[PDB]
Design a protein around this ligand. Structure first.
Ligand code: HEM
Ligand code: HEM
Ligand code: GLC
Lengths: 716, 716
């Protein structure tokens, strides 16, 4: 049954797997109530942090009747809240994470693992109310967690504000399963489907009752190890994170799970966007039901100390069931009876642990890490500080974006740092001079453009890693990436740009210097200025200097792995192992570059004729002109005098012939989608009209400049 | 199975009937390749119309191998094209129509009834190519049809350019049926579901083989009568349209319908956005297969004459079947054998008609109209001209919008015309003076604001009918509309404004005058300036004079019926017979006002406290203040100190109580959705913060001013 648009119906219902260009217009300006002048960086730098901290530290100790506070302190709940907000991150595509406060929107707000955090978010309204424009929910949600930690005795490594709120949810592939807590994502031995980073649909990392509900610690550890790995956490960081978290607070499963109402997005209006309404007892506090598990890890649930580990090794564990029928461990032979305080004044309870908590003692690598901390709790405190910090800042992008008086100076490898400007910067005259020098270097328009795109286009906008700043194109791994093709030139191109760097720098007027990283981008710009004149157009391509050159030591090769493009329609590259065909991988790539459909479109057309393609293949190259910047791609794409068919050599390519029956052009799926898809073709008709050529060049230059500048938060 | 976003997956899949705010951000700026400076009106006024016309005439006579031209002329095909582009229009919501050139996007590009028009659109590319930015496809598609008519000997009444192209499809409820050509839309005797205007899913009006494939002319007529009626056509207009159209061209069904490939949106990339590829013979021209019916109405298929009616009455008709097995009539006893020319040089054929063509002779009302024109073909010509003109211009809005040197001066009733400015206009000092006079009039902030909103908010953005210009609030039917509530005041308000109109006008300085229509809007603005100070805020509400006062003679009461709000969340009105609950009807209304979510939101929260509601009901009115302009609505909507439940008196309302158990607020679905829905609540938190109040006022004014000015194409 097709439905009203206002109820969700549309063209996706008629052609289930059509290309959805709505990924190229998420969070549109028109749905943003702040208006165009709004600059959060400027707002949030007026915020009195101290007052905010204290305003938060009051909300924590001021219980509220509609969700009373465990042990008269919401801190632990907030820590969980923040950990869940940041804990959706995954390294494969850099999406998830706390960076856009997405936990307040669907689907995340209604994930089973985020049960009860609806009420946690609500409790902070009085803080938001007070601070308004100057404080994003995104910053608030994780700052609350960081304040909770400090409040209850744990001194963190620091904090950074900057996270800009958005107004419609970021749409993200979370898995194929159409049922909450479902599993259709493993294959082979236990290989987790790429790009997911959770073991079941609706969870953060793993199942707290062990794999598929099976409470075997040893196995659970394999799931922990691997999911946490896919959120950028190695064994140490992972163990630090779990013990540190579970040093505070408790689970909730005081009665049957079937007396819990529907999730927020499916709840009735009177609940005011809150869900999971419990008819068991008071439904809250004492009778709270969040996970279904009823554990309290430590006997100091609102203080920081070594209790968690002391208790983990200090007892022997056996399987039991919570009052809701979920697995958990409690201590053998009624040991530690009544040593654990009740959240609301009741009598004491026995020690308890999750299945997954036992993983930290049973798994041999984790045993070794946690035993060590059993006797050296200060190594724990330190490791938890670093990993917590990393956790809630992983998607913040370059350091430049980190704001506030709580940001520490120290450089961290995982931030993919770049050096500070150490010299003066090239002015107009030196830029102009350097462009000439590059044009005479003997490097072709194709080489220069390819190399510039290679480096800059490594940026992804999800976690804002990658980009041309750093000059990492010449380091491992970027330099040896198939798509960047070391077997092609590249090394020839690098060498030549290093020679020009040194020459300019040896003869520089006084104290101006230029980085390698700036020259790579500058080369492309020059090359494009050259191809503009070759097409009888005179323009200057804008260029913003400032990039600095990282070194191999300051570049984590392993972490850079996830940015290797396994596909890039802008160079007609298509590797193996992509989850959908080429036209969809093109769009997702455009998404990751923050590009709009117009922008995506101009770049493809421009890039092709400039000779940007992988191995310089002829695919898409609809021009007779050599390294000239024309709209030829478009004009030829709309030539009905040409007839397209799959290549006989059935290889994902197409042959376009004329009246004479001779192949005239070749193209791939990525090329032809622009003339097939009715929305994209519309755009091609703008850029392929007879009056279109100046506009094509202008917009192409603007889009190119946009990609070059993507990671340049240092000047914004 | 949940899918990747880029393949269509999203939150709609998890909660099938959730509120889709994407109706309030259609055709976003970021996906428009023209840029912000683009002004079609200024582009299209540079177009040389004569050259365009000749450029189009050349395309019509220049056949192309991939779809050769019937009788060496594409005119008829373009007429059909244009008629289908305009012929999706429906009066109930004023959506469909030619105004946004939506035929080139999904779903319309792939409707069955639009089969072959993919190729018809493609033929015009050379025209668009040449004209570029100065000509929308929207204007081109219908203009082509208009040029085809003139070219083949029919002088039309005129034409207006102005249709601005869009870049993503307008999403519109076309019916519930999940199958092409399906029928789940009739009930009772044969009541067609509101708001549809076609008998089956994917058709324009009716089935050319008669109701549900049953070739009974008498019955078909009932469908024709009523579908055409719902596209604003009476019996005369309707018969004129059919005979006029079918004077030209032919149908296509030369072989089996199962040898026709999939529709455009489901076709493979190599077809370049074309569909219905036919393996029957050459697949085109002689072997063309469009509808499956093989009729050629007249023996002069590329000239305008009275052949159609001469043939209809000149013969006796019997059932037969096209080579593809569809129903049609041909002439009895081998009469007129070989008198009808073949589209590609073949031997002649017998006379033929559609089932729905025979309706025009069999139905008694149609028989009377068409018999008359059998002998008076000039009455036909005249009627066809007026009805065609109306057809392709119905959604163009106020006359101001109509551009180009081919627009005739003559006023038409169906355009809901307003008079020309006949006097000078009030300047700053008379505006300011008139505001004070209104403030002293003894009319309350509630009355003034209600009335303004009542008139202005009659605008729907789909066909751009309605609005405050015309001053039709005081005329039938707008004055006697339940929601406008004549039983309320209104008449008191009108009278008082007419008095102030005359007073100012009798004492005007020289030759300045003010219309009633301007005062209604000016009132509301004053009222709001008043409530701004009452809330300790000093602002001037912008106001744009120029509206003129229509009369009852110049106001088609019947046609204004479809604009009666059957719901309006902005005044908490909710009539009966709406298709979905109140919160959805709110959004759809916001869509019709061209409002964004931020805009919709500020208005509701402003309007409530100003006392805008239907019967001044207390619902939503979350303020202690009387006719004051505060954000109170928001602040109170986010008070957790209040607990909401349905009203015991189960009447679609809600009671919100405090700690004391006493009802403190009441609200409806429309009110509470703003605190339930996670996206809307996010907006509410902007406007409820402590720093929010200035911004609330500013944006509220901007949004109010935007609704006042909706129909003011006379100043844009
Ligand atoms: C193996 C990884 C983890 C698993 C399987 C896990 C599972 C859980 C579960 C099921 C709950 C109970 C939710 C409820 O029903 O109330 C919980 C609570 C909690 N978690 Fe974890 N968690 C993990 C890691 C973490 C991490 C990394 C942190 C933070 C660094 C953390 C901090 C907390 C805190 C403070 C609570 C207490 C909630 C309250 O006081 O109301 N957990 N965890
Ligand atoms: C009772 C309402 C109508 C019905 C049932 C109807 C049906 C049809 C059908 C089914 C075709 C076959 C398309 C093909 O096989 O190529 C056709 C052709 C055509 N129709 Fe109508 N139509 C209606 C109203 C109109 C109107 C209002 C016009 C415009 C005034 C019109 C103009 C045309 C023209 C010009 C063609 C010939 C196209 C060509 O030569 O390729 N029709 N009609
Ligand atoms: O960012 C680093 C680069 O620029 C600096 O100005 C140095 O002089 C140069 O040696 C270095 O390669």
């Amino acid at each position: 049954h097709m439905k009203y648009p206002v109820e969700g119906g549309g063209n996706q219902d008629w052609w289930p797997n059509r290309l959805n260009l709505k990924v190229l217009h998420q969070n549109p300006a028109v749905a943003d109530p702040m208006g165009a002048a709004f600059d959060y960086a400027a707002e949030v730098a007026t915020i009195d942090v101290d007052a905010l901290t204290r305003d938060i530290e009051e909300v924590m100790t001021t219980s509220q009747p509609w969700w009373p506070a465990d042990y008269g302190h919401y801190g632990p709940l907030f820590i969980r809240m923040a950990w869940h907000a940041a804990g959706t991150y995954r390294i494969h595509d850099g999406r998830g994470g706390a960076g856009g406060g997405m936990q307040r929107f669907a689907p995340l707000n209604s994930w089973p693992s985020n049960a009860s955090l609806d009420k946690a978010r609500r409790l902070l309204w009085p803080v938001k109310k007070k601070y308004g424009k100057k404080l994003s929910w995104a910053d608030l949600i994780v700052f609350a967690g960081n304040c909770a930690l400090e409040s209850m005795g744990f001194k963190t490594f620091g904090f950074g504000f900057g996270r800009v709120d958005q107004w419609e949810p970021d749409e993200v592939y979370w898995g194929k399963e159409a049922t909450w807590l479902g599993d259709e994502r493993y294959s082979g031995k236990r290989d987790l489907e790429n790009p997911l980073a959770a073991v079941q649909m609706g969870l953060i990392y793993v199942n707290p009752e062990g794999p598929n509900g099976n409470p075997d610690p040893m196995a659970a550890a394999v799931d922990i190890r691997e999911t946490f790995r896919r959120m950028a956490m190695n064994d140490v960081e992972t163990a630090a994170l779990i013990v540190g978290g579970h040093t505070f607070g408790k689970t909730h499963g005081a009665g049957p799970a079937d007396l819990v109402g529907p999730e927020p997005e499916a709840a009735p209006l009177e609940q005011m966007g809150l869900g999971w309404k419990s008819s068991y007892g008071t439904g809250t506090g004492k009778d709270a039901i969040t996970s279904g598990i009823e554990v309290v890890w430590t006997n100091t649930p609102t203080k920081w100390d070594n209790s968690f580990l002391e208790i983990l090794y200090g007892y022997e564990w056996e399987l039991t069931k919570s009052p809701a029928g979920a697995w958990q461990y409690t201590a053998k032979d009624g040991a530690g009876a009544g040593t654990i305080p009740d959240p609301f004044g009741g009598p004491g309870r026995s020690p308890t642990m999750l299945a997954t908590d036992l993983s930290l003692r049973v798994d041999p690598i984790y045993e070794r890490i946690t035993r060590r901390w059993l006797e050296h709790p200060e190594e724990l405190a330190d490791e938890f500080a670093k990993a917590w910090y990393k956790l809630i800042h992983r998607d913040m992008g370059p350091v430049a974006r980190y704001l506030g008086p709580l940001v520490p100076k120290q450089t961290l490898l995982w931030q993919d740092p770049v050096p500070a400007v150490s010299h003066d910067l090239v002015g107009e005259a030196e830029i102009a001079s350097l462009k000439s020098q590059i044009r005479a270097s003997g490097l072709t328009v194709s080489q220069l453009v390819s190399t510039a795109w290679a480096a800059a286009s490594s940026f992804r906008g999800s976690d804002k890693r990658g980009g041309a700043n750093g000059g990492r194109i010449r380091l491992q791994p970027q330099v040896g990436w198939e798509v960047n093709d070391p077997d092609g030139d590249l090394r020839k191109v690098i060498r030549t740009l290093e020679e020009i760097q040194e020459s300019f720098n040896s003869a520089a007027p006084g104290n101006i210097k230029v980085s390698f990283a700036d020259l790579v981008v500058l080369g492309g710009c020059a090359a494009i200025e050259k191809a503009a004149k070759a097409a009888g157009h005179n323009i200057t391509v804008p260029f913003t200097p400032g990039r600095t050159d990282a070194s191999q030591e300051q570049t984590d090769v392993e972490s850079f792995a996830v940015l290797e493009p396994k596909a890039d329609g802008f160079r007609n590259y298509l590797g193996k192992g992509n989850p959908l065909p080429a036209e969809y991988m093109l769009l997702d790539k455009a998404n990751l570059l923050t590009l709009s459909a117009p922008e995506m479109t101009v770049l493809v057309g421009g890039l092709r004729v400039l000779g940007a393609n992988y191995k310089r293949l002829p695919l898409g190259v609809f021009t007779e002109a050599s390294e000239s910047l024309t709209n030829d791609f478009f004009v030829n794409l709309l030539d009905m005098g040409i007839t397209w068919e799959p290549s006989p050599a059935d290889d994902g390519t197409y042959q376009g012939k004329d009246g004479s029956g001779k192949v005239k052009w070749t193209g791939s799926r990525v090329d032809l989608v622009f003339g097939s898809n009715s929305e994209l073709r519309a755009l091609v008709e703008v850029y392929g009209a007879d009056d279109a050529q100046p506009k094509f060049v202008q917009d192409f230059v603007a889009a190119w400049d946009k990609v070059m500048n993507l990671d340049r938060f240092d000047v914004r």
